[PDB]
C-alpha cells in the first residue's frame, strides 16, 4: 500500500509559536490528503481536507500546504488546548491509510509538584494486598523520579507508575506511583516514604507516614 | 351456533374436492359436448374419439348392437354408428377428381 | 466527455476494421470479454455502441463486467453478460493542464447503483440528511459531481 | 446536531462473534458513506471497512472475509458483524460519516472491543486516606476488561479531578487511581464519593473517601 | 382488531354492596370472554370464562352475564380483599385483546393520617444531597395535600410524592413526600416543617424539626 | 401444584437481545398451550405470543418478525427469544398456560424487561431517623433499573411494612422509601435491619435503622 | 483458492482427438512476435482455476 510517514514523532514548542508538521507519502497522492486532531479520550476531529481547505468550525490558525509526496500542517499560533495527536490520511489510493501520528506538547513554565502519600486502606489490608500511592500533582516537565523508601530499602521495580496526559487548562502533569505488598510483608516495617526528584525542586521531596498512626 | 351471530362466527359448510389421478383408467370426466348432425356435406366428424373428414350419408348396413364402426378390406373406416341416435352412416371421401 | 455524461456513438451501416485498433501500439488496455479479439473481423453484428469518456488511471479496472466502484456504481455500469471490448489509453498529454483541468467530472453521490448502460446527467443537489433541503446547497446537501483535477 | 453513538463493544473470546451498532442522528445512514475505523490501544488509527451510499461494502486486507458492514434503513442504524476474532482485533472502533470515503468530518464516540480468553472480573474499590489544600481519591484495582469510568459526587465535581489511565499489572488485571484536590475549608465538612462504573461487568460502587 | 372498552375506569363502592363492571366489544364476540383479577404487584387471576362459568377456587360472589357486545361482571358482596384491577378479555376474534381495566376501590370510614417527618441522615447530608421525608400513615380518602415549609418558604414543586396502593387488610393508604435539597442550600435554614391537609383533620397537622438537634 | 417461574429479565439496550425462560411445574409444556403476555408499567395487559400444543407459534402485529416463542420438551421449559428491541417493549412479561389460547387459568410470576440505553446502577441506602408508636425506615435512592426488593429482619417482619412504589426523578433514577410502624416498647430493645436487594446490579445492603 | 489445476486457454490450432499438449511457450495473440518473452498481447497459455 502507501506508507504514510509523519515527522516529528513528538513536537514540543512554547505557546504562541508556529508549529509545522510534515507528512510524507510513499507514492504521489496529489492533493488527496486530510488532517485529523484526536484529543486524549475523544474521537478524531477533521481539521482540513483536500490538503488546503479548512473544515467549518476549525479556527483560522490551522492551515495546510504541499502536494504530491510532501505535505505540511501549519499552526500559526499554538494555544493551550492543542495538546493532541495529529494524523495525516491519504485517500487517493484504494486503501485508506492513516499516518503514525504526531504528539504536540505545549512548553509552559516550570512548576514544582505537590506531593501526597496515601497509605493502604484497612479494607484493602484484610484481602492480603497493600497499596501505597504516591501522587505528584500539577508539575512540568514530565521527567520526574520516584524512589520508594521502606525504612531505607533499596526498592527496585516493585512499583507501577501512571502519568496523565498534559492538561488543556494549565499544561501540567500528574503522576501516581503504586507500590504493592503482601499483608505479612507490609507490616514488618514501620515508616514508609516516597522521595521525588524533579527539575523544579532544589532538594528531593520526601513524604512519609508511620504504620502505627 | 345462534342465528344472532355476526359474520365469522356463523356456520359455514365446506366441501373440499380433491381430484386425484392414479394410473388406473380415468372414469371421471366432464360433459362431452355434442352438436347437431349435418348430413350430405363434407364435414370433419369426431365420433367417440374416431376423427376424420367425409360426407356422412344414410346406410343400409345393419350393425350388431355392440359394434360401432365399420371397415372395408383396406382397414379404413367407411361406416359408423351415431351415438345419439342409433343409426348407421356410410362415410364417403370428399370428392376428388383429375382436372 | 466526462464519465457522468459519457458519449455514445451508434456505429451502424458500415464495415469495421477492428484490427487497426487491436494492432495499434497506443492502447494501454484492450480487454475483449464476450468475444475473442482476432475473431472480430469475421463476426457480423447488428450494431455497435461506442461509449467514450475519460477517467483516472486507477479507475480503469472498474470498467469490467461485475466490478464495483465509484465509476461502476454511479457513472458507468457494464452488465454481467457483457460482450464487447474495453479499450483504454493514457491521455496525460491531452486532458491535463498546468492550472488544473476541471472540465472532467464524475458522480460521487447517488441513492442507488446504476443499471447497466444507464446514463444519469442530473445535477440536482444530493439530499444526504433528509432534512427539508429545498434545493439550496449547504450542510447535508451535497453537489453530486466531483471534478478530476 | 449530527451525533453517532456506538454500542455492542465488550469482552469476547478468540474465535467469537460480536455485532457492533452505530445509531445516528442528523442524517440518514441509508444515503451516506459510512466507515468503521479502529485504533489499537497506544497505536494509530486503522481503517477497517466502508459502506457506500448505494450499498457497496469494502474491507481492509486484515479484516476481509471475517467482518461484515451493513445497515438497516428504517431505523437509521449501521451495524458491523465481527466473526472469527483474532488477538490483534482488540481496539476502539469508530463509525464515521464520510464524503465519498475520502475524509471523515463526523466521528462517533467509539466502542472498545477486547478479544482475550480472560474472564470478566468486577473491580475492587479502595479509599485513599487523606492527610491549604489536600488530595483524596480512590484506587480501583483488579478488574477486567477496560474501561472503568470514575465520576465524583454524581458528576457534579469535574474540576481538579485526575482520573489516571489504568496500568496493566503483572497478574493481567488493571488498576487506576482517581484523585481530587480540595481546599481545607470544605475538607473536613464534605465527604467525597467516587462513582466507579465498570460497564462490562455491570457494576457501580459509590465508595466514600473520609478523613 | 376488536377494541375492548371497560366502564367505569375507577369504581368506588362501600363494602357489602353489589358492583357491576361493564365491558363492550367493538364487534359481536358471542360468549367468548374471560375476566381476570390483578392485585397490585401480583399476576392476574382468572375469575370467570365463557362469560358465565366460574373458575374453580373462585368464590360464589363473582358472577357474569351478557352476550355479543355487552357483558357484565357482578360482585354481589364487595369485601376488603377485592381491591384490584379487573380485565375483560375476548378470545373469539384472531388477536387476543384485553380491556382497559377497572380499578375497584373500597369505601371505608374516614381515617385521619398518622404524620411523621424524617430528617435527612447525616450519612446522606455529607454527600451534597438532602431528603426530608414526610410520611402519612393509614388514612382514607386518598386526597391529601402536603405543603412544605422551610422557615415559611413558599415551596412549589420541589418535592416528589408516592402513594401506596389501597390495603387489603384495612383499606387505608400511605403517602410519602420527599423534599430534595443541596447541602449548601439545606443548611441555610434551621427549622423544617411538613403541613398536611386532609378531609379527616379539623386543622392541618404541622410536624417540624430543627437542624441543630 | 402448577407453578410457572420466569427468569432472564433485566436491563437491555435498544436493538439488543434477550432470552426469557419460563420453568413449569405441575404440567408438561410440550403438550400445553403457552402464551407470553406483557403489561406496560401503568398500562393494561397486551398479548405478545402463543405456542400451541402441536407446536404452532403465533405473534401479535407489534412483535411479529422480531420475537420468537419456543419450548424445549425434555426439561419442561418455555423460552421467548427477543430481538431488535424498541423503546416500547419495556414491560412485565408473564408466561401463562391457556385452554387452547382462549383463557389463561394459570399465570407466571412475571419478569421485567427494561429497554433503555442507561446503565445499571446500584442503590444507595440511607436510614430515616425516628423521633405509643413510632415509624422507622430506610430510603433507597438513585438506582437503575427496577426493581429493588426491601425486606425487614430477614423477612421475619411483614406486618406494618409499607414499601412505597418508586418515583422517577428528574435525573432519570428511581427512589423508594420503606417504612415500618413499631410500638415504643420494642423500639429501644430490638434492632431493625432493612435487607435491600437489587438483583439487576447484584447488591445486598443490610443497613440497620437505629434511634 | 486451489491453483494446482490449470487449463490451456490459448493455442494456435485445434487439437487432434486424444492428443496431449504440455508445451508452455508464450502465446502470440497479436501481430508483434513474443520471441519467448511476455509483453503486450503475449501470455502464458495455461491459466489456473480459482
Ligand atoms: C338419447 O336421447 C334421445 C332423445 O332424448 C333418445 O331418442 C335416444 O334414445 C337417447 N340415446 C340413448 C343411448 O339413451
C149 part of contact set with chain A, CB < 8 Å? yes
Q: Which of D184, D192, F124, D127 shows the shortest CA–CA distance to E126? A: D192
Residue A126's closest chain D neighbor by CA?
Answer: D126
State whether E121 and E203 are in the same domain: yes
D11 part of contact set with chain E, CB < 8 Å? no
Q: What is the rounded distance in angstroms from the CA atom of residue C88 to the CA atom of residue C127?
A: 34
Task: Tell me whether residues B9 and E28 touch, CB distance under 8 A.
Answer: yes
CA of B85 relative to ligand 1 center, distance in Å:
6
DSSP sequence for chain C: -BGGG-EEEEE-SS---GGGTTT-TT-SEEEESSS-SGGGGT---S-EEEEE-B--STTGGGSSTT--SHIIIII----TT--SEEEE---TTTS--TT--TT-EEE---SSPPPTT------PPEESS-S---S--BTTEE-SEEE--
Nearest neighbour of D126 by CB, restricted to A36, A38, A121: A121
User: Touch between chain D and chain E (3+ CB pairs, < 8 Å)?
Assistant: yes
Domains contained in chain F, CATH given: 3-115 (2.60.40.10), 124-209 (2.60.40.10)
Nearest neighbour of D204 by CB, restricted to F13, F117, F121: F121
Residue G32's closest chain C neighbor by CA?
Answer: C23
N-term to C-term CA, chain D: 45
> What's the gap in Å between the CA of B25 and the closest CA on chain E?
45
Which residues neighbour E169 within 8 Å (Cβ) at sequence distance 6 or greater?
A: E80
Which residues neighbour D106 within 8 Å (Cβ) at sequence distance 6 or greater?
A: D2, D4, D96, D97
Domain's final residue, options E72, E106, E140: E106
C-alpha to C-alpha distances, F208 to D103, E116, F128, F138, F140, nearest whole angstrom: 60, 19, 10, 9, 13
What is the resolution in angstroms? 3.3
State whether A86 and A161 are in the same domain: no
- Chain D interface mutation, best of F116, F119, F198, highest count of D Cβ atoms under 10 Å: F119
Task: Tell me whether residues D206 and F122 touch, CB distance under 8 A.
Answer: yes
φ, ψ at D121 (rounded to 5°): -125, 130
State whether A130 and A69 are in the same domain: no
State whether E95 and E127 are in the same domain: no
Residue D187's closest chain E neighbor by CA?
Answer: E126
State whether E49 and E87 are in the same domain: yes
Cα dihedral F7, F9, F10, F13 sign: positive
Using an 8 Å CB-CB cutoff, list residues of chain C that contact chain G: 22-23, 25, 30, 37-38
**Domain containing E85: what range?**
4-106
State whether E34 and E61 are in the same domain: yes
Q: How was this structure determined?
A: cryo-EM
Please give the grid coordinates belonging to residue E151: 422557615
Q: Which of F124, F112, F134, F132 shows the shortest CA–CA distance to F177? A: F124
Residue E147 has a CB neighbour count (10 Å cut-off) of: 17
Domain's final residue, options E76, E106, E136: E106
Please give the grid coordinates belonging to residue C47: 450494431
φ, ψ at C135 (rounded to 5°): 95, -35
Tell me the HSE value of E122 on the side-chain side, using a 13 A CA sphere.
5
- Number of domains into which chain E is organized: 2
CB contacts of D76 in chain C (<8 Å) are none
State whether A144 and A98 are in the same domain: no
Q: What is the rounded distance in angstroms from the CA atom of residue D72 to the CA atom of residue D34?
A: 13
State whether E119 and E99 are in the same domain: no
Q: Which of A115, A122, A120, A108 shows the shortest CA–CA distance to A194? A: A115
Q: What is the rounded distance in angstroms from the CA atom of residue B47 to the CA atom of residue B27?
A: 19
Q: What is the CATH classification number for the domain harbouring A125?
A: 2.60.40.10
CB contacts of C30 in chain G (<8 Å) are 41
DSSP sequence for A85-150: EEEEEE-SSSS-EE---EEEEE----BPPEEEEEPPPHHHHTTTEEEEEEEEEEEBSS-EEEEEEE
State whether A99 and A118 are in the same domain: no
Domain's final residue, options A46, A77, A106: A106
Please give the grid coordinates belonging to residue C98: 498546468
Q: Which of E21, E58, E209, E34 shows the shortest CA–CA distance to E133? A: E209
Task: Tell me whether residues D128 and A96 touch, CB distance under 8 A.
Answer: no
N-term to C-term CA, chain G: 5
Cα dihedral B51, B55, B58, B61 sign: negative
Tell me the HSE value of E196 on the side-chain side, using a 13 A CA sphere.
27
Q: Is D83 helix (H, G, I), strand (E, B) or coil?
A: strand
Task: Tell me whether residues D166 and A162 touch, CB distance under 8 A.
Answer: yes
State whether A62 and A120 are in the same domain: no
Q: Is the peptide bond before A141 cis (omega within 30 degrees of 0)?
A: yes
> What's the gap in Å between the CA of E168 and the closest CA on chain D?
37
State whether A183 and A135 are in the same domain: yes
B11 part of contact set with chain E, CB < 8 Å? no
F161 part of contact set with chain E, CB < 8 Å? no
Residue F166's closest chain E neighbor by CA?
Answer: E162
State whether A101 and A135 are in the same domain: no
Question: CB–CB of D151/D173 below 8 Å?
Answer: no
Task: Tell me whether residues F120 and D21 touch, CB distance under 8 A.
Answer: no
> What's the gap in Å between the CA of E79 and the closest CA on chain B?
37
Amino acid at each position: 500500500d502507501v506508507v504514510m510517514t509523519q515527522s516529528p514523532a513528538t513536537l514540543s514548542l512554547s505557546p504562541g509559536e508556529k508549529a509545522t508538521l510534515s507528512c510524507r507519502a510513499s507514492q504521489s497522492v496529489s492533493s488527496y490528503l486530510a488532517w485529523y486532531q484526536q484529543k486524549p479520550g475523544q474521537p478524531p476531529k477533521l481539521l482540513i481536507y483536500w490538503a488546503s481547505t479548512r473544515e467549518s468550525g476549525v479556527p483560522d490558525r490551522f492551515s495546510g500546504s504541499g502536494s504530491g509526496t510532501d505535505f505540511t500542517l501549519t499552526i500559526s499560533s499554538l494555544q493551550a488546548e492543542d495538546v493532541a495527536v495529529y494524523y495525516c490520511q491519504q485517500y487517493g489510493s484504494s486503501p485508506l491509510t492513516f499516518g503514525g501520528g504526531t504528539k504536540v506538547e505545549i512548553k509552559r513554565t516550570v512548576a514544582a509538584p505537590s506531593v501526597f502519600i496515601f497509605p493502604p486502606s484497612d479494607e484493602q489490608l484484610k484481602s492480603g494486598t497493600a497499596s501505597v500511592v504516591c501522587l505528584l500533582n500539577n508539575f512540568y516537565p514530565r521527567e520526574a523520579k520516584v524512589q520508594w523508601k521502606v525504612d531505607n530499602a533499596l526498592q527496585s521495580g516493585n512499583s507501577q507508575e501512571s502519568v496523565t496526559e498534559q492538561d488543556s487548562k494549565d499544561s501540567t502533569y500528574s503522576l501516581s506511583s503504586t507500590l504493592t505488598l503482601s499483608k505479612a510483608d507490609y507490616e514488618k516495617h514501620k515508616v514508609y516514604a516516597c522521595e521525588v526528584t524533579h527539575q523544579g525542586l532544589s532538594s528531593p521531596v520526601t513524604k512519609s507516614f508511620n504504620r502505627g498512626e | 351456533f345462534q342465528p344472532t351471530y355476526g359474520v365469522g362466527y356463523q356456520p359455514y359448510r365446506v366441501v373440499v374436492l380433491s381430484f386425484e389421478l392414479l394410473h388406473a383408467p380415468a372414469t371421471v370426466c366432464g360433459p362431452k359436448k355434442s352438436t347437431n348432425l349435418v348430413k350430405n356435406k363434407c364435414v370433419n366428424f369426431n365420433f367417440n374419439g374416431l376423427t376424420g373428414t367425409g360426407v356422412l350419408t344414410e346406410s343400409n348396413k345393419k350393425f350388431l348392437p355392440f359394434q360401432q364402426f365399420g371397415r372395408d378390406i383396406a382397414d379404413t373406416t367407411d361406416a359408423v354408428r351415431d351415438p345419439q341416435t342409433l343409426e348407421i352412416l356410410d362415410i364417403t371421401p370428399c370428392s376428388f377428381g383429375g382436372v | 466527455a466526462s464519465v457522468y455524461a459519457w458519449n455514445r456513438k451508434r456505429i451502424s451501416n458500415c464495415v469495421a476494421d477492428y484490427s487497426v485498433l487491436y494492432n495499434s501500439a497506443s492502447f494501454s488496455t484492450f480487454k475483449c470479454y464476450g468475444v475473442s479479439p482476432t475473431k472480430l473481423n469475421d463476426l457480423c453484428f447488428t450494431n455497435v455502441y461506442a461509449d467514450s469518456f475519460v477517467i483516472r488511471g486507477d479507475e480503469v479496472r472498474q470498467i469490467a463486467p461485475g466490478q464495483t466502484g465509484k465509476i461502476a456504481d454511479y457513472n458507468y455500469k457494464l452488465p454481467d453478460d457483457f460482450t464487447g471490448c474495453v479499450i483504454a489509453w493514457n491521455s496525460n498529454n491531452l486532458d491535463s493542464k498546468v492550472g488544473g483541468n476541471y472540465n472532467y467530472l464524475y458522480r460521487l453521490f447517488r441513492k442507488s447503483n446504476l443499471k447497466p448502460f444507464e446514463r444519469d446527467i442530473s445535477t440536482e443537489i444530493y439530499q444526504a440528511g433528509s432534512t427539508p433541503c429545498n434545493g439550496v446547497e449547504g450542510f447535508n446537501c451535497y453537489f453530486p459531481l466531483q471534478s478530476y483535477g | 446536531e449530527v451525533q453517532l453513538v456506538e454500542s455492542g463493544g465488550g469482552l469476547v473470546q478468540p474465535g467469537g462473534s460480536l455485532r457492533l451498532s452505530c445509531a445516528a442522528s442528523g442524517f440518514t445512514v441509508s444515503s451516506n458513506y459510512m466507515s468503521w475505523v479502529r485504533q489499537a490501544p497506544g497505536k494509530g488509527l486503522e481503517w477497517v471497512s466502508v459502506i457506500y451510499s448505494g450499498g457497496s461494502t469494502y474491507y481492509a486486507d486484515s479484516v476481509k472475509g471475517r467482518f461484515t458492514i451493513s445497515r438497516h434503513n428504517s431505523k437509521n442504524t449501521l451495524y458491523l458483524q465481527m466473526n472469527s476474532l483474532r488477538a490483534e482485533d482488540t481496539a476502539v472502533y469508530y463509525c464515521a460519516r464520510g464524503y465519498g470515503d475520502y475524509y471523515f468530518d463526523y466521528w462517533g464516540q467509539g466502542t472498545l472491543v477486547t478479544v482475550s480468553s480472560a474472564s470478566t472480573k468486577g473491580p475492587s474499590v479502595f479509599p485513599l486516606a487523606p492527610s491549604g489544600t489536600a488530595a483524596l481519591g480512590c484506587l480501583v484495582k483488579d478488574y477486567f476488561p477496560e474501561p472503568v469510568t470514575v465520576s465524583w459526587n454524581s458528576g457534579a465535581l469535574t474540576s481538579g479531578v485526575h482520573t489516571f489511565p489504568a496500568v496493566l499489572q503483572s497478574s493481567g488485571l488493571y488498576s487506576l487511581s482517581s484523585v481530587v484536590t480540595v481546599p481545607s475549608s470544605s475538607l473536613g465538612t464534605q465527604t467525597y464519593i467516587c462513582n466507579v462504573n465498570h460497564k462490562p461487568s455491570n457494576t457501580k460502587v459509590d465508595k466514600k473517601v473520609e478523613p
